[PDB]
């Protein structure tokens, strides 16, 4: 069986090599480079007692949520800085938090292997319990369906009303660290601790493509604005861009001065800028097409744990282990 | 504006929870299933001299633990339990201790090392490591147990000087003084943190 798998992998690699006629860098050589991006810190949200582990922008582009080490889930108003909500968690080992597109629900989870779903109308409304590993990520499809990933090397699609796993996704050989939903909400991508990423069909429940370009564990995954590509950040101090149609890696964003992993990635509204948070306490803004570092976001006293870009693209929120959330424009 | 009133109420509650959070010391319990960790996620809350200790034993995940260990960066101490009776798995415990000690995200955390089941070791000695033959007991209180302790202390003192410390203890299955020992080593850890702050280290 090993020989057949090796032969199939060699055939896939040969097909990919034949497909690759030009390179993204060569194509994007006659376009004007993006000027020096100098984004300033417009807001600083304080109130978390310990490290901030995750955040998620609301679809209204004004309210956001954040999860902290002290077992707190705080919903902030980004404009006025005022705190909208503060939810205490039963377990203080949260790893992820999500905002519903409708804005009525907020999900979280962590080392308890549970996805807790809270109704903002604030008490818990649902507890999804089918995973045998820590819950690493969760994204809402609507008020009734949610996609989660866990450290037991599987992903799941849950019907919130019944609290049961509608679908399961298997194939990753390492703990799944991140997932990203396509704009059409018909496909999603997942990165795990096996240096591989996978594209899953939500309706069918089967893996479509597997992308293996990274050298170490993939901690962050983000989806291109038009849904035909995605970017991944890993522990080998590099970010990579993959195209679904070409089924291969396009560009690599790295410099021979970064020896720390990437904890978060995000795209701007047009997709021209790629923002990545690092363990060296700073964030880097790259030109996606030209693979050049367009700028740096500095001002966090600890490693940047979470990073998000607003739905209208008017702000970037970064949360770090320094217990602060900073909004940049 | 009612939004400012709600924010102020939330901030007052957050201050109360800040007091509660800072008034508690959290510990991470590590060790193999061979060792007697339980006898020493499961949560154990105890009190010593009106001081609250919360110890967490994480045993609900797989054996790949390089990702969820980072959740315990700001833990007060790591209680590492080792079965000194079993020589077969002693090197596994040594490798586990070395990996815990040299981790990038656990390089500022002190380890209370418990050498459990010292009665079984004493029985087994009375009627794996070739360096034991060329070993002499130190000028400490009252050979095999001190050999194992020195094996752990060599790893402890090889790296991480001044940032974190190891506190070895000899333990039995019917020892009732482990909480006091944990309290004392936690006191020393707090003292070391204060000294490192006062000198801007």
């Amino acid at each position, epitope marked *: 069986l090993r020989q057949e798998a090796e032969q199939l992998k060699n055939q896939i690699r040969d097909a990919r090599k034949a497909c690759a006629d030009a390179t993204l860098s060569q194509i994007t050589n006659n376009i004007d480079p993006v000027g020096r991006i100098q984004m300033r810190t417009r807001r600083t949200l304080r109130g978390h007692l310990a490290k901030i582990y995750a955040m998620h922008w609301g679809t209204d582009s004004r309210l956001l949520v954040s999860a902290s080490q002290d077992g707190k889930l705080i919903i902030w108003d980004s404009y006025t800085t005022n705190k909208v909500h503060a939810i205490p968690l039963r377990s203080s080992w949260v790893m992820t938090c999500a905002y519903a597109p409708s804005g009525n629900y907020v999900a979280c989870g962590g080392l308890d292997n549970i996805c807790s779903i809270y109704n903002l109308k604030v008490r818990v409304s649902r507890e999804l319990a089918g995973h045998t590993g820590y819950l690493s990520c969760c994204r809402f499809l609507d008020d009734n369906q949610i996609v989660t990933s866990s450290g037991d090397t599987t992903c799941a699609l849950w019907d919130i009303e019944t609290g049961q796993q509608t679908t399961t996704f298997t194939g990753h050989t390492g703990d799944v660290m991140s997932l990203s939903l396509a704009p059409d909400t018909r496909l999603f991508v997942s990165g795990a601790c096996d*240096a591989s990423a996978k594209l899953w069909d939500v309706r069918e429940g089967m893996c479509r493509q597997t992308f293996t370009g990274h050298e170490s564990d993939i901690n962050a995954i983000c989806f291109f604005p038009n849904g035909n590509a995605f970017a991944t950040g890993s*522990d080998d101090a590099t970010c990579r861009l993959f195209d679904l149609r070409a089924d291969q890696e396009l560009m690599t964003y790295s410099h021979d001065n970064i020896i720390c992993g990437i904890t978060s990635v995000s795209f701007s509204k047009s997709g021209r800028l790629l923002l990545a948070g690092y363990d060296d306490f700073n964030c880097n803004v790259w030109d996606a097409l030209k693979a050049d570092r367009a700028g740096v976001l500095a001002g966090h006293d600890n490693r940047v744990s979470c990073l998000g870009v607003t739905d209208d693209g008017m702000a970037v929120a970064t949360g770090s282990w320094d217990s602060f959330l900073k909004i940049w424009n | 504006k009612a939004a400012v009133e709600r924010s102020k109420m939330i901030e007052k509650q957050l201050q109360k929870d800040k007091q509660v959070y800072r008034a508690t010391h959290r510990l991470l319990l590590l060790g193999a299933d061979n060792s007697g960790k339980s006898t020493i996620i499961f949560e154990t809350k105890f009190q010593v001299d009106k001081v609250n200790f919360h110890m967490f034993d994480v045993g609900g995940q797989r*054996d790949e633990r390089r990702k969820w260990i980072q959740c315990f960066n700001d833990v007060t101490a790591i209680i590492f339990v080792v079965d000194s009776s079993d020589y077969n798995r002693l090197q596994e415990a040594l490798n586990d201790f070395k990996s815990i000690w040299n981790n990038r995200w656990l390089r500022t955390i002190s380890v209370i090392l418990f050498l459990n089941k010292q009665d079984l070791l004493a029985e087994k000695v009375l009627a794996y*490591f070739p360096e034991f033959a060329r070993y002499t007991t130190p000028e400490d209180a009252t050979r095999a147990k001190y050999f194992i302790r020195d094996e752990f202390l060599r790893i402890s003192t090889a790296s991480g000087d001044g940032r974190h410390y190891c506190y070895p203890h000899f333990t039995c299955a019917v020892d009732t003084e482990n909480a006091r020992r944990i309290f004392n080593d936690c006191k020393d850890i707090i003292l070391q943190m204060n000294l490192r702050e006062y000198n801007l280290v």
Partner: nanobody, 114 residues
């Protein structure tokens, strides 16, 4: 695609590595004995620096790495399946989950019978 291929089964076990920068990681030699679990044999850093061995084979086995050739050698002079394992991340002096039941950055192994 990270690939580790083991060859050899006195012996001169070799491990050819591909899909990653070999001269950036700390390599390990591990075994699985019949009816037992995965046991760590030896460990070598990324620059020929400090080398560790297990007690059972201390002084009898040796480990080397050819960064230019991107190979890991183990010279031996018990019956088990030997694997060459990689540290999860570069520039870190600690291999954490190398002796795990399902490790992603470990080779297929070669059988050795004595």
């Amino acid at each position: 695609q990270v690939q580790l291929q083991e060859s050899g089964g006195s012996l001169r076990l070799s491990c050819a590595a591909s899909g990653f920068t070999f001269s950036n990681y700390k390599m390990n030699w591990v075994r699985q004995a019949p009816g037992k679990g995965l046991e760590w044999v030896s460990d070598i850093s990324q620059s020929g620096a400090s080398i560790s061995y297990t007690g059972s084979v201390k002084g009898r086995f040796t480990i080397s790495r050819d960064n230019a050739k991107n190979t890991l050698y183990l010279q031996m002079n018990d019956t088990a399946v030997y694997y060459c394992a990689r540290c999860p991340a570069p520039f870190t002096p600690f291999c954490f989950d190398v002796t795990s039941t399902t490790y992603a950055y470990r080779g297929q192994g070669t059988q050795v019978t004595v």
